[PDB]
Amino acid sequence: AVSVEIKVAGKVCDYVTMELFQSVSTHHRFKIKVNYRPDKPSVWAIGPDVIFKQLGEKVSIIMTHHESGEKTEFHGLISDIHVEGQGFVILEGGSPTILLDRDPAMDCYVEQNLNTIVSDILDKSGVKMNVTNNPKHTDIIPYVARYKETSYGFLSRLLRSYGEWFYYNGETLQIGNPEIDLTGVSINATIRSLNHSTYEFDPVNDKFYYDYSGTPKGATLGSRSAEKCSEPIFPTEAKLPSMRPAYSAMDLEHYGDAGFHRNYSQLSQIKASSRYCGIRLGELVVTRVPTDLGRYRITEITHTVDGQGRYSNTFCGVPGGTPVMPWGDAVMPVAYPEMARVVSNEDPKNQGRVKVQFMWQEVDGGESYWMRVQSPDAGKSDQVAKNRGFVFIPEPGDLVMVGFEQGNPDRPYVTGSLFYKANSQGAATDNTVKSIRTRSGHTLEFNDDEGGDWGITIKDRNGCMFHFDTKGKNIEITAPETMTLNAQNININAGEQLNTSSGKETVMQIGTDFQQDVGGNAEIAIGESLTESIAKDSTNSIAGNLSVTVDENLMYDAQDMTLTAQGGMKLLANAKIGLKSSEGVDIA
Amino acid sequence: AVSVEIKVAGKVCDYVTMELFQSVSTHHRFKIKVNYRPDKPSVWAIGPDVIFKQLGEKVSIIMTHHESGEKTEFHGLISDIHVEGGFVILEGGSPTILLDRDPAMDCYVEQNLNTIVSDILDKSGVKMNVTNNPKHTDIIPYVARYKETSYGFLSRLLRSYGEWFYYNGETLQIGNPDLTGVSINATIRSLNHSTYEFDPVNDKFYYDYSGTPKGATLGSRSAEKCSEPIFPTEAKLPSMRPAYSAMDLEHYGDAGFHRNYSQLSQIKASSRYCGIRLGELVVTRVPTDLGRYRITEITHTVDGQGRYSNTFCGVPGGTPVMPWGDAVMPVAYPEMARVVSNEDPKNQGRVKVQFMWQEVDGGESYWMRVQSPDAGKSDQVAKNRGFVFIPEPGDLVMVGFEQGNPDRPYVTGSLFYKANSQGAATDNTVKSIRTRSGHTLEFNDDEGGDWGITIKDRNGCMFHFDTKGKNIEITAPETMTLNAQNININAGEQLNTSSGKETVMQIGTDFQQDVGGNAEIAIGESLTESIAKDSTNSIAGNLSVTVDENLMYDAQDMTLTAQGGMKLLANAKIGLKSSEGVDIA
Amino acid sequence: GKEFVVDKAMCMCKYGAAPGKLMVTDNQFFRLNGTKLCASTMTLGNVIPGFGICKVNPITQWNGQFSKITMMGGNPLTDKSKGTCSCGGPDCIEFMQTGQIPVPGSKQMQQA
């Protein structure tokens, strides 16, 4: 009925049994039992080697229906060879994506779309495959991380998390929607909850995206009966976060509708079998019992031929018209804090984000996208619109601890910084030093050594210093250049002696009265001339004696001069006493 | 031609069927179906509980080949007993099975593999012979046993360092010491892989590319050659266990590469010969040479008829490292701990903490890095640039783990619990930074109360910005000094100077005092003024000098010039005393 | 009393018919009206052509002086003071011009 021909490296294979599993969400896998005729040399004569040199060789499986002429063709590679025994060989392998699932590695992609990511992943591998790279989501993804995943694992998780069809069609690896009797039919229906919603907070845009359950696209009659039965069972809305980061409202809408349609496809399905090789993967089949059971899209199919040559066929189907293919073979990774190095902080969005380089980018170079830096205090207020709290953005070259929001490697952030070897002198003796230092040398330091330099210090590199001496209970303010005090009122109160000392000159400018009240003696010593000028009357009152001793001449000038003594006057001179006047002298 | 003797606690066991499984990577496991003859009392006459007393009893299994005279010997302990109705089934396995039933926390600080293994085996009550000769004799700073049984912890730790760790049928070996059917298998595997590890304590980056094979057969070479062009891009991965040197990561990457390579081609085989033993080398020949293989696991089966069969698997001989097997890496999550010291001998700001599981019985960890909101270095600072507040002993900290590794702990931050915190202020008013002495940098946001900023210590010195009053207060209990080249004291309205005892103006060169209004001086005692040069005084108004006591003037030449009249008034005599003459013109 | 008698003050005796001029020698210290020695109560004796010839038949006292000035044991003479003479009678010597000549200066040449 069906003739199956297998060609290994272009040569027709003599097989006894063959199994071939194909799926739109999992590797195709073939297992072929090769016959070795007694006349030809046996497997032991050829050897384990020579036989093992067929690893990676192409395998072509062509299944032909003689009655209808329809052909199913599959091209794959060999990944396993078993030589056991009169002695035969087991050729195991499948779609070339099998050899894409063996290289777990760490990598990242910055500001790239799905097309470029898939092209780069497939270019870095040595497996040869025709590729139809047509993803629907054409937007640039800010950051994607490959976290200990194989090439196939990373690509599968990334593409299926975006709703993109990603499967081997038997000849080419297809990304994106392709836009394309029975013997053991079996229809099943299950109770599934369609009352679910997804959420995602975007801090770069400060938006809370919310998506509720969408509308069915591909639904059979059993699907509708199952949906009707399940509607009363789940009256509460199940809220879940997005497994994949969402950067826009439309992005979350697409994520949510992909999830809803996966659920609705699992609402009811078909499990059929036949002996017809024209039933292909990813195609539509209208199933009839001997009448219509619904149109179903084939998601997986197992073509097989036993020893007698009796071809058989068995397949799974989802309601035809489902926009998204089943989620299978894909597992989202879980990421844990990693040490990294800051490479930049010139954030274009001006949000305090930094760009770091992980430890797996140390040798060959590279950097991440912009990630938030966690702060002990951060926020805003009515008086402080922006940048409230602790704002210390890391400098390039800083060793940092990078945590991951939720478990997602695509959601990294800086949890903090580390003092390892190249930037730490450690704690002082018994700690005792707690300092905030910037890159210019601005120091805000507390010294707790009560037997040493106990106190507080605010200083700069140039020499400005402001010191609390707790042991001595002193305060010092030092400016190498000018120091200026400005206030409406200045109050310099000293409980003991007050000292003022200028190196050059003390200049005292008073715009109004000058009150000086001395409770004790006054001692003025002037090393040069004293010049005094009064714009009005000068009054002096002395309760004791007045003694003025002048070494050189004394001169007094006035308009009228009255010298009245309550006791006696004595004018003593050594040369002369002249009382010349222009009007005469009178004794009265 | 194989006879099998089974002895339970030294007594010959009458067994209907036997299964035995030995492996170099997991537990040995046996299943013996003990027969109960009709003439002897049944299992119900004896009672399952009485039969159960055989839990933990030694079992000896001797399979001897009659023609060759070779013997295989196994010594295990019974772990499970099933009395079925009747007969008894004993599932004991190797003694390491009883070492895999006690998950617990533990830590080993600055120990080598020998000491950790000896400690684990001494703490347990399973008595078995041990050949503890692990190849890696260097000490390890920190090893954490995290929710792990004794056997599981030992397995993952010894297979992380590439040591052989398996029961040989009579001894727990730690460290390197005619077929019926056959099945040789080849796989495509990637040898283009590399391992990386950053050491912050030594500030180094360790990179290890894939090594070179030792135990390669023809199938291994064929598979390697076939898979060579399939993986042109190297896959970088981090080490599962921490590495403290370049040679350490070389060993780790070598073990990984050899484990990966040994699976390129492997063998499975069947036999009826008791000379193939676990961990031995056999030459596989077609009943023409398939290669030399080390037996990694082997099964010994006796059916009801008494016929002994054998099924085993083998890795390419010459492979240095046995399969990963039972070993599994644990995943750690943030814990709470108490800082016990911060006297880091390497002077890297690291602290030593004690976890909550090591609290009742005591104990510490190794030194761990402390996470900081700001940390790094610059050209001018070059060390301790950022936020350096090292935790003090007794602090309650949250301990995170780098990656998932319990052996890579670090301090994430400190916690304010019942004893640490006293609470926020009115509407969360006070934001403070305090040290252990009492130094306080405080911001008070209560605009209706003590709104403002404060820098203070516990001895009295204070610097207070009174934001409500717009004032600035600087208080020193003893002395306040202001040093600068130029000092300007600019008062918008008032400048008040007050001194309790003395005000001492020590002017360097010149004194300028410009008063825009009145000058009022009140001197409470004597005034003493000295001038070393001239003394000029200009008065645009009236000059009054009223002395309550005697007035004395001395000079060389005295001249009084009155632009109007001069008056000499006295209540007593006026003395005009001179030497060369008195002229009253 | 208004003025003070100084050296070379014009004076007459009640008998001698010649207006002689006073001579001051007890004072070399107290000058006034320029450089004219002041006449005191110690200007006694031949302190004066002593009025030409005597005519009593055809200095010991200086009453009338100023008592508020003491110039070395004596008091200054005044325009109303009268002197005696041992050869004559009490209060015989008088004064008309007491040797004080006011020379006018720049201030006194503006008030005219």
Binding site: V585, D586, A588 | - | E3, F4, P102, G105, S106, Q108
Partner: peptide
């Protein structure tokens, strides 16, 4: 010049 003046009684 100021000349000379008279010392008299007020």
């Amino acid at each position: 010049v100021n000349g000379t003046m008279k010392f008299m009684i007020a």
